Amino acid sequence: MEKLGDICFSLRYVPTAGKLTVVILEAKNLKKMDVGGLSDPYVKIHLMQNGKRLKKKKTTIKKNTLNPYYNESFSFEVPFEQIQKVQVVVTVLDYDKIGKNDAIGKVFVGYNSTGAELRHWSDMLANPRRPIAQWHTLQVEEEVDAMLA
Ligand SMILES: [Ca+2]
Ligand SMILES: [Ca+2]
Ligand SMILES: [Ca+2]
Ligand SMILES: [Ca+2]
């Protein structure tokens, strides 16, 4: 579908600690969202269960780059009886000094995820020994929101 860029993040889930850790690592080949410029990307994470947004986090903003590096870690309290139902939604947006920020693209992993998104989630569930990083193709916001609704 649309060439919007790719996002790399790691996942780890430790049931005895009830802790899900998501590290936003880097993105690549992001779409330009500023006329006569590049983009000023930041990343949002939503933790969702049953269509309800339970937690939200945001990375810092990187100026003028289509290939940002973050290495920003976020942790979430998720008990073992809930982990199978959660969705981790990752959105890359372009910060604008004036007006609304511009969503570049979005992806989710977790309950009801598909393809490489499901694979990453499954790998996390099987291997709490270490964080597992994987790249993900960004999709247009409208498409992902439809799959989450
Ligand atoms: Ca813009
Ligand atoms: Ca800026
Ligand atoms: Ca901008
Ligand atoms: Ca704007």
Curated annotation (Swiss-Prot):
Modified-residue entries (Phosphoserine), positions: S73, S75
Gene responsible for this protein: Syt1
Binding site for Ca(2+) 5: D34, D94, D96, D102
Annotated function: Calcium sensor that participates in triggering neurotransmitter release at the synapse. May have a regulatory role in the membrane interactions during trafficking of synaptic vesicles at the active zone of the synapse. It binds acidic phospholipids with a specificity that requires the presence of both an acidic head group and a diacyl backbone. A Ca(2+)-dependent interaction between synaptotagmin and putative receptors for activated protein kinase C has also been reported. It can bind to at least three additional proteins in a Ca(2+)-independent manner; these are neurexins, syntaxin and AP2.
Impact when changing N101K: Slows synaptic vesicle fusion kinetics and exocytosis
Post-translational modification remark: Glycosylated.
Record protein name field: Synaptotagmin-1
Binding residue positions for Ca(2+) 4: D34, D40, D94, D96
Oligomeric form and interacting partners: Homotetramer. Heterodimer; heterodimerizes with SYT2 in presence of calcium. Interacts with SCAMP5. Interacts with STON2. Forms a complex with SV2B, syntaxin 1 and SNAP25. Interacts with SV2A, SV2B and SV2C. Interacts with RIMS1. Interacts with PRRT2. Interacts with DNAJC5 in a phosphorylation-dependent manner. Interacts (via N-terminus) with RAB3A. Interacts with SYT12. Interacts with calmodulin. Interacts with DNM1 (via C-terminal proline-rich domain (PRD)); this interaction facilitates vesicle fission during clathrin-mediated endocytosis (CME). (Microbial infection) Interacts with C.botulinum neurotoxin type B (BoNT/B, botB). Has lower affinity for BoNT/B than Syt2; mutating its residues to match those in Syt2 increases its affinity.
Cell compartment(s), UniProt: Cytoplasmic vesicle, Secretory vesicle membrane; Cytoplasmic vesicle, Secretory vesicle, Synaptic vesicle membrane; Cytoplasmic vesicle, Secretory vesicle, Chromaffin granule membrane; Cytoplasm
Domain notes: The first C2 domain mediates Ca(2+)-dependent phospholipid binding. The second C2 domain mediates interaction with SV2A and probably with STN2.
Family under the similarity heading: Belongs to the synaptotagmin family.
Domain C2: 3-136
Organism: Rattus norvegicus
Tissues/organs with expression: Expressed in the brain (at protein level). Predominantly expressed in rostral, phylogenetically younger brain regions, and in some endocrine tissues.
